[PDB]
C-alpha cells in the first residue's frame, strides 16, 4: 500500500510498492482519495492510472485496498439527475458543498440515503420459492410516468427466506433475503454492475418495428427501425437538438439518455427548461420530461479517462433500463470528439499509430460499443421485451469524410439522414439531402407496411423515382432554358414541385403541425400520387387521341384542386377529429376524379 508515486508523462501519474491485486481494479490514493486504476503489473509492484491532477502527490502516501473494479450504482432515483463520466451526483454535490468549482475527495454516494420510496411487493412469491437472476420481486413508483422495477442481480439465485411488506424504506434497508445451498445473502434496493461486461439476455429478437419520428420527412422517405443503429451528420448551427427533442417528445420510446463529449451548459439548461416547456400530453396532462431523462455529459476539462468512460457509463445505464421491459434511445452525440478521446487516451500509451495516431484497438472499441443494441427478450419469468437504439451523430471535420472512424461507422449503420447546410440556407426544413440519404432497413419494414397500409411502399418508390427524374429534367431544362419542353414531363415537374413544397416540409413553428400522424402522411401521398397518375395518363392519351391536354388547360381546370392540395397541411388534427380529416381527404380525391372526368 506504499505510495511510490512517480512523476508524469501527461495528465496521469503512476505508483508502485503494493501487494498482489488484480488489474483494472479501482483503488484510492493519498488523503484526497483520487480515482486510480491498475493497468500494468511487474514483480511485486503495480502501475496505476490516476484521473485527477497529479499535483502534490508525495512518496509514502497511503493507497487504500479495495475489492471491486470500475462499476456503476444502479437503482431508484437515477431518473432526473445530472452525472459526469464517472457517475458523480453533480447537483447533489453542488447542493452539499455550496461551492463553485469541482471539489476533491468526492466521497458521496451516487444516490442519496435519506429519501424514502413507496414499495409494492410482487404479491405472488412466497418465502421458500426459488428465484433466479433477473426476476422482478418489487416495483417502485419513482414517478407517475415510469415505474422503476427491481430485479434480482444476475449471477445469483436461491430459496427465499424473507419478503418485506409494502412500506416506506430507503436504499440501505433490507427487503428481500434468500438462501443458496450452503449460505444466505440479503438484498437491498441497489445493485452494482461492472462497466466492462455486458449483462446477459435470453435471446436477441430481430428489429421488426419502425422508430417513429415527429415529422413526415425522414419518416416516410428514410425511416429508422426501433432498437436500430443510425448515423446523422450534424454540426454547429445546422440544428442537431431538433431531432433530439423530436425523439424526446413525439416518439414511441420510453426513456432518453443523452451522452456526449465536451458539452456546454447551454444544452443542459435548455433541456432542463424544455422539461416543463416541451412536455407531452400522454393522458391530456403536461408533465416534466425530467422524469423521462437521465443526463450524462463531460466538458473538455474532465480528465480524458472520465471523458472516455462516459460512453460506457451511458450504455450500461441504458442496458440496465432496457432490462426493465422498456424502450430506449441513446443519443451517442459527439462521435468525432469520442474518437479524439480515444486518440488522447492512446497518447499516454506510446502505441503504434495505426492511422494518424489511432490506437490499434480502435476497431475493437468501435465493435464493442456500437454492437450492444437491438431488441432482446429479457431474462426473467414474466417475459418482458425491450430494446436499445443508438444514434451516433457524425461530426465530420469540416465536411471531409477522410476519417477512418467516419467510414467505419458508416459501414455499420444502415440508415443515413444527410444534412446540407445550403438547404438550410434556402429556408427549407428539415434540411435533407434527398439523394445521399438512404435506408437499407426498408426490407425489415416491408412486412410492417403491408399488414396495415398495403399502399405506402409503391408510393415511397414512386417518390424516390420522381425525385431522381426531377433532377434529370432539371439537367435537361438548364441545357434547354426552361422554356421548351413537352407537357408529358411538365406534369412530373409540377408534381415534384408540389411534393417538395408541401409534403417534404413540416414547420415546427406551426402551432398544430408539429407532429404529422403517419396515416395522415399516407393519405396525403396517396392523394397527390393519384392526381399525378391521372394527369399524366390524360396528357399521354390525348397527346394523339384528341384535344391535346396541356399545362394551361389542366392548371385552369384545377386551380381549385391545386390550392386545395397546397392547403391540405392546414388540418389541425389536434382539434379536428381524425375521421373528419380522412373523410375530407377522400372527398377531395373524389373531387379530383370528378374534375378530370368533366375534362373528358
Amino acid at each position: 500500500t506504499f505510495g511510490y508515486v512517480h512523476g508524469v508523462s501527461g495528465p496521469v501519474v503512476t505508483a508502485c510498492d503494493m501487494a498482489g491485486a488484480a488489474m483494472y481494479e479501482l483503488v484510492r490514493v493519498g488523503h484526497s482519495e483520487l480515482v486510480g486504476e491498475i493497468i500494468r503489473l511487474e514483480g511485486d509492484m503495480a502501475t496505476i492510472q490516476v484521473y485527477e491532477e497529479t499535483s502534490g502527490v508525495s512518496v509514502g502516501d497511503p493507497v487504500l485496498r479495495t475489492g471491486k473494479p470500475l462499476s456503476v450504482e444502479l437503482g431508484p432515483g437515477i431518473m432526473g439527475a445530472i452525472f459526469d463520466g464517472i457517475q458523480r451526483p453533480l447537483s447533489d454535490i453542488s447542493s452539499q458543498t455550496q461551492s463553485i468549482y469541482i471539489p476533491r475527495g468526492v466521497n458521496v454516494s451516487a444516490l442519496s440515503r435519506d429519501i424514502k420510496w413507496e414499495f409494492i411487493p410482487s404479491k405472488n412469491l412466497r418465502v421458500g420459492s426459488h428465484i433466479t437472476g433477473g426476476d422482478i420481486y418489487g416495483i417502485v413508483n419513482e414517478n407517475s410516468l415510469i415505474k422503476h422495477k427491481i430485479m434480482l442481480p444476475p449471477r445469483n439465485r436461491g430459496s427465499v427466506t424473507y419478503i418485506a411488506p409494502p412500506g416506506n424504506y430507503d436504499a440501505s434497508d433490507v427487503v428481500l433475503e434468500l438462501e443458496f445451498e450452503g449460505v444466505k445473502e440479503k438484498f437491498s434496493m441497489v445493485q452494482v454492475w461492472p462497466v466492462r461486461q455486458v449483462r446477459p439476455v435470453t435471446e436477441k429478437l430481430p428489429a421488426n418495428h419502425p422508430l417513429l419520428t415527429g415529422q413526415r420527412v425522414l419518416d416516410a422517405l428514410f425511416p429508422c427501425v426501433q432498437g436500430g443503429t443510425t448515423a446523422i451528420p450534424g454540426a454547429f448551427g445546422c440544428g442537431k437538438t431538433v431531432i433530439s427533442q423530436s425523439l424526446s417528445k413525439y416518439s414511441n420510446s420510453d426513456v432518453i439518455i443523452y451522452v456526449g463529449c465536451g458539452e456546454r451548459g447551454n444544452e443542459m439548461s435548455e433541456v432542463l427548461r424544455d422539461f416543463p416547456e416541451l412536455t407531452m400530453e400522454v393522458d391530456g396532462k403536461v408533465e416534466s420530461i425530467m422524469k423521462r431523462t437521465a443526463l450524462v455529459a463531460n466538458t473538455s476539462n474532465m480528465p480524458v479517462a472520465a471523458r472516455e468512460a462516459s460512453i460506457y457509463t451511458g450504455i450500461t445505464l441504458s442496458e440496465y433500463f432496457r432490462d426493465m421491459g422498456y424502450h430506449v434511445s441513446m443519443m451517442a452525440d459527439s462521435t468525432s470528439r469520442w474518437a479524439e478521446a480515444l486518440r488522447e487516451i492512446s497518447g499516454r500509451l506510446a502505441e503504434m499509430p495505426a492511422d494518424s495516431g489511432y490506437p490499434a484497438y480502435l476497431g475493437a472499441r468501435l465493435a464493442s460499443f456500437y454492437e450492444r443494441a437491438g431488441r432482446v427478450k429479457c431474462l426473467g419469468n414474466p417475459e418482458r421485451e425491450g430494446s436499445v437504439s443508438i444514434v451516433g451523430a457524425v461530426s465530420p471535420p469540416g465536411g471531409d469524410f477522410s476519417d477512418p472512424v467516419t467510414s467505419a461507422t458508416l459501414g455499420i449503420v444502415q440508415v443515413f439522414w444527410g444534412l446540407d447546410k445550403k438547404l438550410a440556407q434556402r429556408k427549407h426544413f428539415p434540411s435533407v439531402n434527398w439523394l445521399i440519404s438512404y435506408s437499407k432497413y426498408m426490407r425489415a419494414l416491408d412486412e410492417y407496411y403491408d399488414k396495415h397500409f398495403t399502399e405506402f411502399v409503391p408510393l415511397r418508390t414512386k417518390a424516390k423515382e420522381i425525385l431522381q427524374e426531377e433532377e434529370d429534367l432539371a439537367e435537361i431544362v438548364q441545357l434547354v432554358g426552361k422554356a421548351s419542353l413537352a407537357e408529358t414531363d411538365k406534369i412530373t415537374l409540377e408534381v415534384a414541385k408540389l411534393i417538395k413544397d408541401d409534403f417534404l416540409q413540416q414547420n415546427g413553428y406551426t402551432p398544430y403541425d408539429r407532429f404529422c400522424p403517419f396515416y395522415k402522411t399516407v393519405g396525403m401521398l396517396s392523394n397527390m400520387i393519384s392526381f399525378y397518375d391521372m394527369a399524366r395518363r390524360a396528357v399521354e392519351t390525348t397527346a394523339q387521341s384528341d384535344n391535346k391536354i396541356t399545362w394551361s388547360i389542366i392548371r385552369e381546370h384545377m386551380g381549385e384542386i391545386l390550392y386545395k392540395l397546397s392547403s391540405m397541411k392546414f388540418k389541425d388534427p389536434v382539434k379536428d377529429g381524425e375521421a373528419k380529416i380522412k373523410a375530407d381527404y377522400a372527398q377531395l380525391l373524389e373531387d379530383m376524379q370528378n374534375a378530370f372526368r368533366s375534362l373528358e
Binding site: 512523476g7 502534490g56 453542488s94 463553485i100 486518440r343 499516454r348 471535420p397
Partner: protein
C-alpha cells in the same frame, strides 16, 4: 499553517539540458518548487517533474549554465507554486515569473491560490446573453461577441494582428449606456493582457499605447520577452488566468483577458516535452496537447450566484497560412467562431483589414436581440453580407465582360462595394464607433440601393428606416 523548517541539499547526481537530477531526497512530492544557489551567489528557481524513491528531477527556469556538481545549494519549499493575488495588481507591469518590472515594490497579497487553480462546475454555468462592444465596426456590426464567447483571431506572419489587438484593448467597453447617461457611470470593466512569446518592439508598443490611452487604472499587463527563458513561457498563462478568476469571482468585475501568439506557447510545450523525453505526436507536438490547451482556454464564462464574467480572446499565428495546422485545428474543437484577416486587403492599404466573408459566430443568434439592443442588428448584418457578396460578384463580372454590359443595379452594386470598402472596413486607428453609429453608417451605405432591391430587410422595418 505549515511551521516546519526547510530542507536543503548539496548532492547532485547529474545534469542534462534544462534539467537537474539529485538523489537522497527525503519524501519528495510532485511539482514542488525549489530555490537553487550557484557558486557565484546567483539564484534560480525551478519545478519538480519526476520523482522515484530518493531520486528526484527539477527543472531550472533560468537555464543550466555553470551549475557545479558539488557546490550548489538546492532547497525545497515544501509546497507547490502559489500566486500572491491582489486587487491592486491593476496599473502594474510584471515579468513572466510575477516579479514586478516597473520599479515598484513587491506585491502585497490579499490571498494565495493554486497556480493551476480549480475548474468551474458545469451546473454553475450561465448561458451568455448580452454583448460586449469592442469599438471596431467590422466586428460589432456584423459579428456579436457575447459575454464569455471564446473567439480566436487567426493570423500569420506579417499581418497587423498586434495593432488590431491593441485597438480592441484600448477601445474596449460596454453597451450599458443604452439605458441612461448618468447610470453608465457605474462601469465595472477590467482588462488583463498577457504578452507571451512577444518580441521587444511589440511589448513596448503595447506598454506605450496603454500608457497613452490613460486607462491604466483597469489594465494588468504580463510581459514575457523573446529572450526570456523558455520554461517561464508556460507559467504566465496560468498566472494571468488565476488573477482574472480572482478579480472576477471575488470582486464581481467583468474581465476581458487576451493571450497573444499562442504558437510560442505551443513551441514551449513542445520543448518541455522533448526535454521530458516522451514519445512525440503528430507533427512532434505532445499527445496531450489538446488536454492542456483545453484546461487553458475554458476558464471563462458566467456562473450562477455571481455578478461577474470573463471573456477569452486568444490570438495565434498560422504557420505558412496552413489552416489545417494542428494548433488552429485543436483550437477549433474548443472555442467558438473564427475571425480572419485578408492579406490582399492589407496589400490594398485598408486598416484594419478584417475579412467579413469567412467570419463566423455561433452565439450571434442570441447574443443580440430585442430589448437588449435595437431590433435592427441581425437583419442589417445579413443584408449587408448579401450586398457585399453580390457586389464582389458584380465586380468580377464587370472585369470579365466590360462596363457596357452592366445594368443600373450592377452600377449600384459596384458603388456600394467601393463605398463599403472605403468607409466600413476602413476605420483608422483611433475612431471609436459605437454600435449605434455603426448601424447608422450601415444604413448610410444601404441608402445607395432602392428599397425594392433590399429584400433581406423586412418591409416592417423598411417603412421605418429607409426614409431617413
Amino acid at each position: 499553517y505549515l511551521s516546519q523548517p526547510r530542507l536543503t541539499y548539496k548532492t547532485v547526481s547529474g545534469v542534462n539540458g534544462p534539467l537537474v537530477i539529485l538523489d537522497h531526497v527525503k519524501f519528495p512530492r510532485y511539482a514542488e518548487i525549489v530555490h537553487l544557489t550557484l557558486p557565484d551567489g546567483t539564484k534560480r528557481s525551478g519545478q519538480v517533474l519526476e520523482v522515484s524513491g530518493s531520486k528526484a528531477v527539477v527543472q531550472v527556469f533560468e537555464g543550466t549554465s555553470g551549475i557545479d556538481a558539488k557546490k550548489t545549494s538546492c532547497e525545497f519549499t515544501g509546497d507547490i507554486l502559489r500566486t500572491p493575488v491582489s486587487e491592486d495588481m491593476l496599473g502594474r507591469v510584471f515579468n513572466g515569473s510575477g516579479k514586478p518590472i516597473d520599479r515598484g515594490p513587491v506585491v502585497l497579497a490579499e490571498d494565495f491560490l493554486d497556480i493551476m487553480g480549480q475548474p468551474i462546475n458545469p451546473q454553475c454555468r450561465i448561458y451568455p446573453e448580452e454583448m460586449i462592444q469592442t469599438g471596431i465596426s467590422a466586428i460589432d456590426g456584423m459579428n456579436s461577441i457575447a459575454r464569455g464567447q471564446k473567439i480566436p483571431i487567426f493570423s500569420a506572419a506579417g499581418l497587423p494582428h498586434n495593432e488590431i489587438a491593441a485597438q480592441i484593448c484600448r477601445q474596449a467597453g460596454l453597451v450599458k449606456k443604452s439605458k441612461d447617461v448618468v447610470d453608465y457611470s457605474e462601469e465595472n470593466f477590467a482588462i488583463v493582457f498577457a504578452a507571451m512569446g512577444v518580441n521587444m518592439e511589440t511589448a513596448r508598443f503595447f506598454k506605450s499605447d496603454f500608457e497613452e490611452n490613460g486607462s491604466m487604472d483597469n489594465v494588468c499587463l504580463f510581459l514575457n520577452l523573446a529572450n526570456d527563458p523558455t520554461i517561464e513561457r508556460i507559467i504566465t498563462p496560468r498566472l494571468a488566468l488565476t488573477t482574472a478568476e480572482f478579480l472576477a469571482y471575488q470582486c464581481e468585475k467583468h474581465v476581458l483577458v487576451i493571450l497573444t501568439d499562442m504558437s510560442s506557447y505551443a513551441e514551449a510545450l513542445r520543448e518541455v516535452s522533448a526535454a521530458r523525453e516522451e514519445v512525440p505526436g503528430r507533427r512532434g507536438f505532445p499527445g496531450y496537447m489538446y488536454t492542456d490547451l483545453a484546461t487553458i482556454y475554458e476558464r471563462a464564462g458566467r456562473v450562477e450566484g455571481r455578478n461577474g464574467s470573463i471573456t477569452q480572446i486568444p490570438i495565434l499565428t498560422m504557420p505558412n497560412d496552413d489552416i489545417t495546422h494542428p494548433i488552429p485545428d485543436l483550437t477549433g474543437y474548443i472555442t467558438e467562431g473564427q475571425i480572419y484577416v485578408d492579406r490582399q486587403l492589407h496589400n490594398r492599404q485598408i486598416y484594419p483589414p478584417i475579412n467579413v466573408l469567412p467570419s463566423l459566430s455561433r452565439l450571434m443568434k442570441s447574443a443580440i436581440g430585442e430589448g437588449m439592443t435595437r431590433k435592427d442588428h441581425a437583419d442589417v448584418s445579413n443584408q449587408l453580407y448579401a450586398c457585399y457578396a453580390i457586389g464582389k460578384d458584380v465586380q468580377a463580372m464587370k472585369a470579365v465582360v466590360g462596363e457596357e454590359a452592366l445594368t443600373s443595379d450592377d452600377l449600384l452594386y459596384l458603388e456600394f462595394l467601393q463605398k463599403f470598402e472605403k468607409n466600413f472596413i476602413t476605420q483608422g486607428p483611433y475612431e471609436n464607433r459605437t454600435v449605434y453609429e455603426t448601424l447608422d453608417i450601415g444604413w448610410q451605405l444601404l441608402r445607395i440601393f432602392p428599397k425594392e432591391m433590399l429584400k433581406r430587410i423586412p418591409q416592417s422595418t423598411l417603412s421605418e428606416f429607409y426614409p431617413r
